[PDB]
Design a protein around this ligand. Structure first.
Ligand SMILES: CCOC(=O)CNC(=O)NCc1ccc(N)cc1
Length: 164
């Protein structure tokens, strides 16, 4: 079935808990596989140690720039960037997992977790999963954001991997 992956998150060195995500490999296999492999670190690089660098309350929490740590970087398991696979899944509400980008066909490693329905992103960002467990943790992360996206605490993915 669809992979389950996890992110363990700290804020200023204090554990916040675990976010568990279902990846919709049935709908977006290429996009799901990229994220899965970046969680396990099996290609020799991935999310472990990277930060949530841009968090905007009542919008989303963004992470996954493990090359530049500022939202300019990251890379996929296929190459620097890969195309938009499809726009079949929509940004239906809180807990949706979607790819960050710099315009059409610029998916890398950066991703975001929505804290509201972001319907205006439909057809622009590829949705590929959702939160199974740990929305309380996501709401904690959200609470350390600001209008500008700057975080008031350093929010680190201390561990990540695949559960099934
Ligand atoms: C709600 C999502 O907001 C964005 O995605 C705003 N864009 C964004 O931060 N773009 C920087 C970026 C650069 C390279 C890659 N691969 C991905 C993203």
């Amino acid at each position: 079935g669809n992979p389950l992956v996890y992110l363990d998150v700290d804020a200023n060195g204090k554990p916040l808990g675990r976010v568990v995500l279902e990846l919709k490999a049935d709908v977006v296999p290429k996009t799901a596989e990229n994220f899965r492999a970046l969680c396990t670190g099996e290609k020799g690089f991935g999310y472990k140690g990277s930060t949530f660098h841009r968090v905007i309350p009542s919008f989303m929490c963004q992470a996954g720039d493990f090359t530049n740590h500022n939202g300019t970087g990251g890379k996929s398991i296929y190459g620097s960037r890969f195309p938009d696979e499809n726009f079949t899944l929509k940004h239906v509400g809180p807990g949706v997992l979607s790819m960050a980008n710099a315009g059409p066909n610029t998916n890398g490693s950066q991703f975001f977790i929505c804290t509201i329905k972001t319907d205006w992103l439909d057809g622009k960002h590829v949705v590929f999963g959702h939160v199974i467990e740990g929305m309380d943790v996501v709401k904690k992360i959200e609470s350390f954001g600001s209008k500008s996206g700057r975080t008031s605490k350093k929010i680190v993915i201390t561990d990540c991997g695949q559960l099934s």
